[PDB]
Design a protein around this ligand. Structure first.
Ligand SMILES: [Mg+2]
Ligand SMILES: [Mg+2]
Ligand SMILES: [Mg+2]
Length: 91
RNA sequence: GGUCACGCACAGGGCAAACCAUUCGAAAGAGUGGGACGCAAAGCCUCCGGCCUAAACCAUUGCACUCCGGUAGGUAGCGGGGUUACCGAUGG
């Protein structure tokens, strides 16, 4: 169940990619070092974000701390990622 | 000479990237002036593919790590295709 990556759902789609990453970064750095923040404004990936943490305990901490946090008008819907990939476990 | 091509020239020359100033645009970018990296159509046209933008509207609650909604705008100096044209190697 737990993961290095957290899947943030239900984001304000009107925000630019530039600012969205920057804001999420300013929000989620409180919990540990972030490897990357993936954000895409494609039809399939709109209103979604992946924060990849250095540590899983950091991810668990951020999820449990900021569930339903009012963020650009809307509460974030955080849940662990299904699979991590990137540069986590070999791939 | 005309036509279809061709660019190893000749001659008249033409256009003008980056950058800068300025204007319009939400942006990509375009216009004008300066300026030349290049260009045998770097004249012109978004019909076909690519790539860039995303303010508005419509749709989407979507689990990605190749990249991708509609819509609209841009690139003709990203290809293709359409169309117009100067010179003419005893030129093919
Ligand atoms: Mg960080
Ligand atoms: Mg000029
Ligand atoms: Mg045009």
């Amino acid at each position: 169940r737990p993961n290095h990556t957290i899947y943030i759902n239900n984001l304000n789609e009107k925000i630019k990619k530039d600012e969205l990453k920057k804001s999420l970064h300013a929000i989620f750095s409180r919990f540990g070092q972030i490897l990357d923040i993936l954000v895409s404004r494609s039809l399939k990936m709109r209103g979604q974000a992946f924060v990849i943490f250095k540590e899983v305990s950091s991810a668990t901490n951020a999820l449990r701390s900021m569930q339903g946090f009012p963020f650009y008008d809307k509460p974030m819907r955080i849940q662990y990622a299904k699979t991590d990939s990137d540069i986590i476990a070999k791939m």
